[PDB]
Design a protein around this ligand. Structure first.
Ligand SMILES: Cc1cc(=O)oc2cc(O)ccc12
Ligand SMILES: Cc1cc(=O)oc2cc(O)ccc12
Ligand SMILES: Cc1cc(=O)oc2cc(O)ccc12
Lengths: 564, 563, 563
């Protein structure tokens, strides 16, 4: 004999904790050749106020896992799990005790407050107890940024000098990926080693895990460094693709379209500038790729927008900590991940993508320029931004602010409006299309009205929603929130909103609250705001495990959709 | 810085050889940020009778490779290549001299005749000089089969005994993957390290590279051991998927459907038999999987067909001990062995065809026949001699008919009276031609459910059928090879596929002379005129070790490779 | 059972080609549980003037390989091999025909002249026909240098600027590693994938394969990037160590001591300068490490020597912009660049010798000279022109003397009056011959701390010295090459080593014609008679791409390879 496999737990197979080895708060009930249907799983709340997690499991899932997927376990706990099915026409039920192990943070040093990120529940309105949020955050590595792309030497550089760096390889950090419930408990953990290894020098396993977005299959896409991925809630890495050889440094976003493709935000490696110098470009290219990893289309933004436009670039906050100081651009800023104009500098900093199925177009959030729609035809359709700095042909594409009745609102070139609640967005994020059809944006608000304010705390962020009339070329602000909440609700970077049709709320995550508060944990604030009354239905704070460490994004995840 | 990159070769960028590192007879012309269109590549023939290779290159390819793909080089040679394009409305052309290195066989030993498999051009009709063929063949490793799946110990077994083996892990061999032109020159090579490593004991890089099929994108799918793949002619691995956790041992076939899914042939690991014993089943499940590697559907053939049917199994060549008829036993231990029941090689399914018309699959069972099975998991029809089949299945058997539609009388063994009609035996590649007919490679071992008096009395056929599903009849409408006898007999493997572009039947017999101890095995590439039956192409491929079968070959077209 | 292993070839086991998968011109005769002794292998020459290769094989090797190691095959050939042994007191012999595959260069592009480096046999004196030489050379990758270490941003730098680079990660190139016989045939090849992968971005498989040195076991040590290695002539990787975490960028040398430790040349990562800025230092630390990869000792040369000394640095060829004298600057950014101070290439140490007699190390500093440093971390003596050196170091300078022991008068630039005596400049391989003398390859760039009127006025020397450490004197006792002029001038790399078996000076000039734009670079293998100065061997190796330096070569002996 050798060693036997786990024996059957009840009326099906063994119950396997973490089948794929990437998700320790998950398990699987082995099917053991049983033919079953009507499968329904219930993970009971831990103790008194504990949140219960419940979902149906589809056939494709049962077939793919060869078993019933168990999602929503607590760490280091004797979880109580109920699985119900139909077998041979008869109704069946098993009760399992599924013991779990611990969540490990593999990236800790003297900066660490503790191992895990802390949660504080601030508000949970009745009827929102069941909400689950996936938090896409990260934690500093001991080493810090240790690698650069090698670039091309400029003719004006010292003859003796080594070659310069290029691109944005140092944009690299350990991931911290979990689902939190409304009691503030971790109910899912993605092992950090799934995608990342910050101790090895294998660039295939470095980067910044970002752009976690749900697919039509209830699975998720993601980007990290030079690869893009698809994974599921069982921790199965379903796709792992290298970027096509011409491109590098995928960050911020990955979204599956209805046509089966995936949009990514990358840079072009070995991009030849008009002066013949080769650079890796920064955050200014869009790819459409298929599940074969092949390029279906590319948008080179350096030829579509205006890379010499510094209207917003010059209005920016230097901040860490050289904070509260307006960015002074320089002609000789060396190429690299650096504020500046031109291909090879961070002139666009595109940070989100939305696919408009209606006209086969894409909407981009550019942190440093504004928000634009670009066609399949590579033509600018419209731009949402202050008018300053834009030249013709592009100035003609700026949308015109109007009111509820459609009458022009009067705005200066800096985007400051007269006698109106209307305001443009500035250093914004997640310009997405809601189920309503409108354009929702997280208006971070750094460099608002194209200047820094008199004092540093005079900043605020907004959840805003616009209605756009494309034929008329008009934009109407139709909803906003957070303007009154001041610095204490200001995320200078990252962050996301998304409209939730099911309970008519606006979901939001402010990812860098108190970023600049030296020695203080950064706050990620999960919010759900009632769309009609503007009341807080959910407010949950996530505190970084090291001081002054931004979070990136969060998602409202629904267990009902996870296992098609 | 420090060391500079390759400089531009002509008017575009550098020309890199084997950019992905898996295809040493390819190159890439870096785009270097040039905006180009109307691209056309030409690789010139080597010497006097050398075959030129020419193709257009699409925008998707330009964008994917960040350059112009150069396919069809010769090894260890100063290839002459011409690239034409349009840029700023101007017509542009470059001529490049692209030097290549050598093709390496990493699996040689005292059995090796030489390093590479030898090609002999026998016949090339005018107008067929341009043809290219991808040969999916293999080469023995020094150690042979070295790993087994662990099975469950049987209760009739000894108390002290170690557990048995199960499944088919030993089905494992180094790949030998190349494209040959009609001068018998190698024009493409897939490095053996791309997918395989027979020296390491990482099961993820083991198995039997098989089922190389073109996709709608001009790329190819393949299976090997516990993974399935997609790659392209630049040697880029586009997909690499583990089989879903319930399944094992993917062999023989992989085909992309029009719905974006892929059909695979696997076995079930930890399959619970009715007597409670768990086994890895052998070559009797079909998976439909999506490009995420998830299971869209599963056909469990042990519940759809009849695993107890020994009609054809009992009548098989044992081949060390070839020639002999296979005497089955009730106690054959579970494993990759001839036998009945789940956990033995009762079915040995070796090809799949998706029928888009009714959303069903056509399967070739080496040991049972050819069957259509529906999305609903119901048998729609069976092409096979009637012996051994019982109701409810017996009634799905197709009935042979003539050109006018009248019954052909056949005994239960598939022997027909006064007819060219014959069923298929131990067959392969039951596919659906562009005509809508069923093409099969009829290997012919166990023909008429018996062994012949003499081994040399065996023959193989290309054969084609017209099926009326409504009427439930089958009509043999084309055959070839019966009259070529033994020197055309492939006991195993092999394939045919109807070519509409030039009305030929393409064929590859993979195991000609397999049983001639000490002799190279012959893989014969053939294009046969569909009307005249004239041999338009015949090329023989000889194994680099004796008694080493080839699997399949494909007719590849350069103008489809780079979408 | 499934697929059988290779069967026995003769009276032992199967004969496997490239058993470890890294050395395609080797084979192994499986022992198959035979108990043998007195083993001798003979690989016969190819054709008329072919060099036979013969050697004994020890019990340790038999046991390690589980078989008889076959070394010295030709590529793509039916090698004839004879194996003799003793078994049960009977004398035994087998003759094997061992077929091989081809040698592959995986790094080719439009710069490629052809796939392999070309060899030209110029001179082979009788009694030197058997000589074998391992050539440690390299080949440009398509992309060139693509990665940098990230450094610490300097406070005099722009607020908006991204952080700078540091260290020498770009020092990275595909290896080209082979053994040539005196017919100029390749008799061994180390697969480039053994250690390197220039297509992937796994830094563990990057760098510059260097410092290949024989060990007391007849195996070899090497360094590449962030790892050090030990391998043998069967292509077996015996050790693979990461550098200790404080260190980076191992280049140029690796030598095993008699105490079981290994000496390496690295840089320090996160080295804190006195101004508080952290850098990866360049080529200025020596590690002694044990076979566990642990640090036994460290020599930090930035505290032992003088990093501010620009005597030789200021006088260097800039070579794109070759010929020009190097005009140093105070603001040269830290990095792999000519300059003073920690974090610039002030030292560029390129060889190490352990002196067992007093437990000290002799170093060659390309930019400073030759120095002995003790276990105690004290400078024992310095071989260099006196310019730029200040006390306390100035006083450790050796003083030149004649055969009778009398002073030779030299200016501060190393120009001597009425003497053959000259110091070394930008030199390499300051080793200790079996005679106890110091041998150096005097490249000669920056000779006499100046550039010449004309570039063609440069020459290189083999040179030998007798040092009295007690007296503090140095005596030039042998030189060669000054009178061969430019066609013998190696600006960089290169090596010599005294051969006692036949009283020759072995040499390899690695960069002959380096600056002839568009021309292959020449690596010249030489054995020079120590008494007569007659050229006993001269073989030229030509780079596969223009202007591509070679590093080193070693004289290898088959009868030592298999302990
Ligand atoms: C300044 C900064 C820090 C960070 O950790 O992440 C970022 C992500 C962005 O998209 C833009 C800016 C930052
Ligand atoms: C009998 C046999 C030997 C082999 O080497 O390969 C095979 C492949 C198959 O699909 C079926 C049978 C065989
Ligand atoms: C100048 C130079 C070029 C090179 O390719 O390799 C080198 C190696 C060295 O140790 C020192 C200098 C060089």
């Amino acid at each position: 004999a050798g060693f036997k496999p786990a024996p059957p737990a009840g009326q099906l197979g063994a119950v396997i904790v973490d089948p794929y080895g990437n998700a320790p708060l998950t398990a699987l009930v082995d099917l053991d050749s049983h033919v079953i249907s009507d499968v329904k799983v219930t993970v009971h709340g831990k103790g008194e106020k504990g949140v219960e997690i419940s979902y149906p499991v589809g056939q494709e899932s049962l077939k793919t896992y060869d078993g019933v997927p168990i999602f929503g376990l607590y760490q280091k706990f004797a979880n109580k799990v109920t699985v119900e099915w139909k077998e041979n026409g008869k109704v069946m039920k098993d009760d399992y005790v599924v013991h779990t192990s611990a969540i490990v943070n593999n990236y800790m040093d003297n900066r660490s407050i503790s191992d895990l990120q802390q949660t504080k529940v601030i508000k949970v309105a009745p009827g929102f107890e069941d909400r689950l949020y996936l938090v896409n955050t990260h934690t500093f590595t001991a080493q810090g940024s240790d690698l650069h792309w090698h670039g091309e030497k400029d003719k004006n550089a010292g003859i003796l000098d080594a070659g310069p760096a290029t691109g944005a390889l140092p944009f690299d950090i350990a991931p911290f990926t979990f689902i939190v419930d409304t009691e503030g408990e971790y109910r899912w953990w993605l092992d950090q080693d799934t995608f990342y290894d910050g101790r090895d020098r294998d660039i295939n396993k470095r980067g910044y895990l970002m752009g976690i977005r749900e697919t039509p299959r209830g699975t998720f896409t993601a980007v990290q460094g030079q690869h893009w991925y698809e994974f599921d809630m069982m921790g199965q890495v379903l796709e792992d693709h290298k970027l096509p050889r011409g491109f590098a440094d995928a960050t911020h976003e990955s979204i599956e379209t209805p046509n089966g493709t995936v949009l990514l935000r990358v840079g072009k490696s070995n991009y030849r500038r008009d002066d013949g110098v080769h650079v890796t470009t920064i955050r200014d290219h869009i790819l459409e790729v298929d599940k074969s990893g092949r390029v279906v289309d590319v948008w080179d933004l350096t030829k579509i927008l205006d890379p010499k436009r510094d209207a917003l670039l010059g209005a920016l906050d230097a901040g860490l900590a050289h904070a509260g100081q307006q960015a002074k651009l320089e002609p000789d800023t060396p190429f690299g991940d650096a504020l500046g104009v031109g291909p090879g500098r961070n002139w666009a900093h595109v940070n989100s993508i939305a696919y408009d199925a209606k006209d086969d177009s894409i909407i981009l959030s550019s942190r440093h320029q504004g928000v634009v729609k670009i066609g399949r035809d590579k033509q600018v359709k419209w731009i949402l931004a202050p008018s300053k700095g834009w030249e013709k042909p592009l100035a003609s594409k700026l949308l015109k602010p109007v009111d509820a009745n459609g009458k022009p609102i009067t705005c200066n070139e800096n985007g400051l409006c007269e006698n109106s609640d209307f305001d443009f967005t500035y250093t914004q994020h997640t310009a997405w299309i809601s189920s309503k059809g409108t354009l929702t944006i997280f208006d971070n608000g750094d460099g608002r009205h194209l200047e820094q304010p008199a004092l540093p705390t005079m900043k605020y962020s907004r959840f805003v929603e616009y209605k756009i009339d494309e034929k008329k070329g008009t934009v109407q602000q139709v909803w906003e929130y957070g303007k009154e909440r001041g610095y204490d609700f200001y995320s200078p970077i990252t962050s996301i909103i998304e409209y939730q049709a099911d309970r008519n709320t606006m979901f939001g995550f402010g990812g860098s609250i108190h970023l600049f508060d030296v020695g203080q944990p950064t706050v990620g604030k999960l919010n759900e705001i009632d769309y009609k009354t503007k009341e807080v239905k959910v407010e949950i704070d996530v505190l970084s495990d090291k001081p002054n460490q931004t979070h990136y994004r969060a998602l409202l995840v629904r267990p009902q959709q996870m296992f098609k």
